[PDB]
Design a protein around this nucleic acid. Structure first.
Lengths: 245, 246
DNA sequence: CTTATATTTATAAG
DNA sequence: CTTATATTTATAAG
């Protein structure tokens, strides 16, 4: 199967990801910015107990570490969601290089109608965060047993530049693959990937190369939602069918 | 004084005006327009008594007359009577707006002419007759507060969207000859607001005398109370004219 | 949790 | 008089 031939490429079998080729990211602040520290709002014991295993897994994986930071933003109960809006306001903007899905799909020619669709799991966490920038994203945590600050050692969710920074990182890591397979079409939308070939055979071995490449580089795709070598797929809210849409 | 010298030309001495040279105006309607009759709102006795003397004066002057018309628009209940003619305005064909804005108007005022006379015409619209065929358009309902029927206007009425333009056009036609017979004077017209500018004080004196005579003879009436005659400094259209400035 | 985003009178007019 | 112009949350999000 596709699962057994490529255990490092699937999130279910390959372990949490780490883009080994990508240096830890530095997050430049606006010249005006000084740290913002927002008090954590209280939460029910149920919410805290629901958050706990997620925090604990991230701690065990080293994705969260203890810190002491002049920054602090609230965690909210919804699994954990961090309100980083006041950090986002203080981070310098970067040029938006991610194409909108419409333009991205315009690069899909009729000649390639065999599709594989993959979504990368915990994509942002594959990218490391430079220690100088880790204090920006600190929050307060108490196990449901004393309170302390934690922050992220990887690119975090809710950070405004995470999608663009990830898209640019993966483009660098898949550049060679594109060279080694000039007859394949590869669409990247952050963590959503579409591979297209003219034939099922080319799609089969092209998907083999892509999965091997992704796992080697330290990315992990969802085997659950993978659509592999199919004439009909869903991608970015579109149904791709008979060369349409 | 000017008051006695030109009694026909002043509102205070010459009575209500009438532009005798202007044919009664016909008011064309839009191609689909049908008469509109909207009910008169009630009004307090206080308001009715306040309006009454104004209505009676206009009846006595022939400016209002009884009528029966399929058109009817309201007199405002709250003491000068104000007629809401908006529903009539919607049904009257538009005309090209020929009145210049004051700024462009004043652009024709050169610095050579720094002797000014300003006149404003009293009850200007009422000087232009309204042709009987168009009078039914402007009917409203009146009941005397002590002793009910429709009245309408035999003159161009207030609140009619084309009254300023139609008056400005009529007066431009009527003062065209004055303009030719007095090439050294500058004459600015803004509906019922007139500025006469001259090179010397005596030209302004003689020119103003001729303008008043011409206005009176034509059937228009200027306000003696507010007139600014032969001055180096006048108020005109919100501006203070002075040294040839503004 | 917080927050960026999408009915109500004051005039003026006729 | 009526008409035209100039404070409030529902929600989606972090």
């Amino acid at each position: 199967t596709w699962l057994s031939d490529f255990p490092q490429a699937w999130a279910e079998t390959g372990g949490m990801g780490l883009a080994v080729r990508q240096a830890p990211l530095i997050i430049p602040l606006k010249a005006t910015s000084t740290p913002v520290s927002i008090k954590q709002y209280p939460m029910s014991q149920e919410a805290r107990l629901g958050i706990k295993p997620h925090i604990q897994r991230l701690l065990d994986q080293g994705i969260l570490v203890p810190c002491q930071s002049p920054w602090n933003t609230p965690l909210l109960p919804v699994r954990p969601v961090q309100d980083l809006r006041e950090v986002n306001k203080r981070v310098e903007d970067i040029h938006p290089t991610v194409p909108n899905p419409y333009n991205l799909l315009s690069g899909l020619p009729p000649s390639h109608q065999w599709y594989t669709v993959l979504d990368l799991k915990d994509a942002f966490f594959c990218l490391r965060l430079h220690p100088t920038s880790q204090p920006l994203f600190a929050f307060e945590w108490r196990d449901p047993g004393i309170s302390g600050q934690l922050t992220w050692t990887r690119l975090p969710q809710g950070f405004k530049n995470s999608p663009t920074l990830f898209d640019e990182a993966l483009h660098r890591d898949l550049a060679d693959f594109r060279i080694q397979h000039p007859d394949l079409i590869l669409l990247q939308y952050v963590d959503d990937l579409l591979l297209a070939a003219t034939s099922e055979l080319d799609c089969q071995q092209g998907t083999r190369a892509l999965l091997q490449t992704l796992g080697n580089l330290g990315y992990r795709a969802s085997a659950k939602k993978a659509q592999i070598c199919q004439k009909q797929v869903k991608y970015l809210g579109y149904l791709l069918k008979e060369g349409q849409r």
